[PDB]
């Protein structure tokens, strides 16, 4: 009569898509979008799963991060899809081990224009745009 819980699970998409008219930027075979509507870090999974088809919350590897930051603005921050699973450090929906500054947080990760690594924030309820990806 009050609250309902929805255990949602998220994975990387198996299909191929790229909106050539509305993408934020593109690198290799992946088209990256910045959500125009700000969201929380947890909501970014659903927000990216529904911006465009075959799109999900992406975590930037050291080689993609400079491009993401170059497509960013001075005062703009961006939630990134790097999450913790205990040991084995931080990872993404694409797998791999990420270098994450985890001193002042352990849950949500974001990047700015001048961020050199993904940085974990102490509060995940902040409203920042999401970084979504779709392979071409």
């Amino acid at each position, epitope marked *: 009569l009050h609250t309902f819980q929805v255990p949602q699970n998220y994975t990387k998409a198996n299909c191929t898509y790229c909106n050539t008219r509305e993408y934020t930027f593109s690198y290799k075979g992946c088209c990256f979008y910045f959500t125009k509507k700000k969201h929380t870090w947890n909501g970014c999974f659903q927000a990216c799963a529904e911006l465009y088809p075959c799109t999900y919350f992406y975590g930037p590897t050291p080689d993609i991060l400079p491009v993401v930051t170059r497509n960013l603005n001075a005062i703009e*921050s961006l939630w990134v899809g790097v999450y913790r699973v205990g040991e084995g450090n931080w990872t993404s929906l694409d797998g791999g081990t990420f*270098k994450v*500054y985890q*001193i*002042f947080g352990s849950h949500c990760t*974001y*990047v*700015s*224009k*001048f*961020s*050199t690594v993904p*940085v974990s924030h*102490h*509060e995940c309820s902040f409203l920042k745009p999401c970084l979504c990806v779709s392979q071409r």
Partner: antibody
Amino acid sequence: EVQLQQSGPELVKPGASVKISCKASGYTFTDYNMHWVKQSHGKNLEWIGFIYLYNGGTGYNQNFKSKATLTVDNSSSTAYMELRSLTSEDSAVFYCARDYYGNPYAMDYWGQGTSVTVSS
Amino acid sequence: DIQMTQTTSSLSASLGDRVTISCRASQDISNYLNWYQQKPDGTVKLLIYYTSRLRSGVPSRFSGSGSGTDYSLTINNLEQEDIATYFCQQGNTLPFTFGSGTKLEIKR
């Protein structure tokens, strides 16, 4: 410009307390962390601690926990540091520092410094 | 327990020369090293962050390099405004720690 204005020089009796102030300016207060560092003698710097400007959460160096207390006034955009039980070894210059946005391992803006003298 | 050791406490060089200040960490700090400059009036401003990233506004005469435990800050074409003390600072773990500092004096 001046964006991090610190309090003036303070002279405190041994064993007493002191409240150093650090006023903010040109930036959104609740998006950063405020660090406090101690410079004793004429060079040696010592990181005292930090405070989350949003919720007021704090973190301290273990050599400063029973001396420093960090507080924040969100509406006035101020960060306060209370030092207690000051001995003649605490005569030093205390700095407040706003960290780099997106790089919290670095402090990109510093105060002018507040000199605290402890003597009878 | 990460300690920062500065190899030198005082450096002397002429105008237009090149000075290199070195810092050493007791353990790997994964490039989380910053270089700050404190001038005689006590004003401190961050020159370099993340080993080599030059903060916007600082002249390109300042540069950084290093890895693991060894890091270095280089000032090329020494100017009279560079008379100051230079500190290294690791941010890899808490508590943050600083180096002893290196005072740069102009030799004439």
